[PDB]
Design an enzyme around this catalytic site. Structure first.
Site: not given
Ligand SMILES: COC(=O)N[C@H](C(=O)NCCC[C@@H]1CNCCO1)C(c1ccccc1)c1ccccc1
Ligand SMILES: [Cl-]
Ligand SMILES: [Cl-]
Ligand SMILES: [Cl-]
Lengths: 99, 99
Positions: B25-27
């Site tokens: 995660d680059t974010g």
């Molecule tokens: C249904 O799909 C999701 O809920 N996807 C989530 C998602 O894309 N969320 C957007 C923000 C992510 C950004 C990521 N960088 C920092 C800022 O927040 C996702 C997730 C992936 C795999 C398994 C459960 C969750 C994730 C990923 C990271 C952190 C937290 C959640």
């Protein structure tokens, strides 16, 4: 370009007649921007990350320019603490992770 | 290797002798893993996500292997939706974004 990760990968984007700063985020499935006006129809959605979920408006087929690259896709609008460019738009500009 | 973003950039990591799946995660400024046992003392840390803030346990100088690349650094443990490899460790493995 080659973007290092010593600092947050912030870029200038062009969207809906506005210039915004956003983070290139490989951990995000979707692109999420702070409150702004966008054209067309929208549908509500709940998106979750660390800290829980937020309610956003989902807009489809939105034109956005990132570092001179024109890309089209879904943009989520809502109370995000940071503007995020997610995988749905990163793929369109040919963005990859390399090590 | 080169990792495209059409799917989530999930990779296998090794920590405390066990294999786990984690998202590159680059974010994310930091690496956050689901509840687990780590050696030594920990310090408190508050991290902000899309939905708000969470409390995590900070462990320093932890051995963690990412795709076979050995790293030694800070690992946070707490209630995350997914294990995340943040910039602190992506820089150790020489990861960059390219387009
Ligand atoms: C249904 O799909 C999701 O809920 N996807 C989530 C998602 O894309 N969320 C957007 C923000 C992510 C950004 C990521 N960088 C920092 C800022 O927040 C996702 C997730 C992936 C795999 C398994 C459960 C969750 C994730 C990923 C990271 C952190 C937290 C959640
Ligand atoms: Cl899309
Ligand atoms: Cl491709
Ligand atoms: Cl570190």
């Amino acid at each position: 370009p080659q973007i290092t990760l010593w600092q947050r990968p912030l870029v200038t984007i062009k969207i809906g007649g506005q210039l915004k700063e956003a983070l290139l985020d490989t951990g995000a499935d979707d692109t999420v921007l702070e409150e702004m006006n966008l054209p067309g129809r929208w549908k509500p959605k709940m998106i979750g990350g660390i800290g829980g979920f937020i309610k956003v408006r989902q807009y489809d087929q939105i034109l956005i320019e990132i570092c001179g690259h024109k890309a089209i896709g879904t943009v989520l609008v809502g109370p995000t603490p940071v503007n995020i460019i997610g995988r749905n738009l990163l793929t369109q500009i040919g963005c990859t992770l390399n090590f």
